[PDB]
Amino acid sequence: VNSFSGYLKLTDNVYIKNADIVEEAKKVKPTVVVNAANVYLKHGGGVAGALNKATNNAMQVESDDYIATNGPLKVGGSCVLSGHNLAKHCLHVVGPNVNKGEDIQLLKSAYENFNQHEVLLAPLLSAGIFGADPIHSLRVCVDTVRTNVYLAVFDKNLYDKLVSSFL
Ligand SMILES: O=C(N[C@@H]1c2cccc(O)c2C[C@@H]1C(=O)O)c1ccc2[nH]ccc2c1
């Protein structure tokens, strides 16, 4: 038993809710919140900009130190950093950004990072400003992630479409 409330169950291990991932994290304080990161960990907009703003820019400060030490992530890769006031940990995961021409097949590799964590609060990778089809992102998620994932979908109209079209 865990503290996520109001989710619709899609599969054995994937759940979904129309919610603001920032507000959900602020209320649940999950062990892991996933950020929709880029390889530079520049949290300017979309989910990343919102999560970072909610940390009062502490996420960005920590991220800049991480990059200065380690260099950029790979598309499809991830790193674990602090969750600040939102979660114990933040898993920064880089899905491919279609608006940069990145190979959509890397989306499966991106979701594989979730399997290293027993339970996660997460957005749909490569959705939103990353330019992928969210219906496809959900199919890859369901077919790749084996751990328990609670997906927060900000847009109500999109949430209803994701549910109504789910096979
Ligand atoms: O950019 C976000 N979300 C994406 C989005 C936005 C508009 C239409 C979309 O289809 C999508 C897919 C993504 C998702 O829902 O994960 C997002 C998330 C939480 C937020 N809180 C405060 C600002 C804010 C923005």
Residue 149 domain-assigned?
Answer: yes
- Ligand 1 centre to CA of 70 (Å) is 28
- Ligand 1 centre to CA of 8 (Å) is 19
Resolution in A: 1.1
- Go through the chain and tell me how many residues it has: 167
Residue 123 domain-assigned?
Answer: yes
- Ligand 1 centre to CA of 2 (Å) is 24
Q: Indicate the burial class of 100 (C-beta count within 10 angstroms; 0-12, 13-18, 19 or more).
A: exposed
User: Does residue 124 contact residue 138 with C-beta atoms inside 8 Å?
Assistant: yes
Domain membership of residue 91 as a residue range: 8-165
- Residue 58 belongs to domain with CATH number: 3.40.220.10
The 10 Å CB-count burial string (b at 16+, else e) for 58-85 is: ebbebbeebeeeeeebebbbbbebebbe
Structural domain total, the chain: 1
String of DSSP letters for 32-91: EEEEE--TT----SHHHHHHHHHTTTHHHHHHHHHHHHH-PPPTT-EEEEE-TTT-SEEE
Residue 3 domain-assigned?
Answer: no
* Residue found under tokens 């703003």: 53
Q: Give the closest residue (by CA) to ligand 1 atom 6.
A: 128
Q: CB under 8 Å to 135, separation ≥6 — which residues?
A: 161, 162, 165
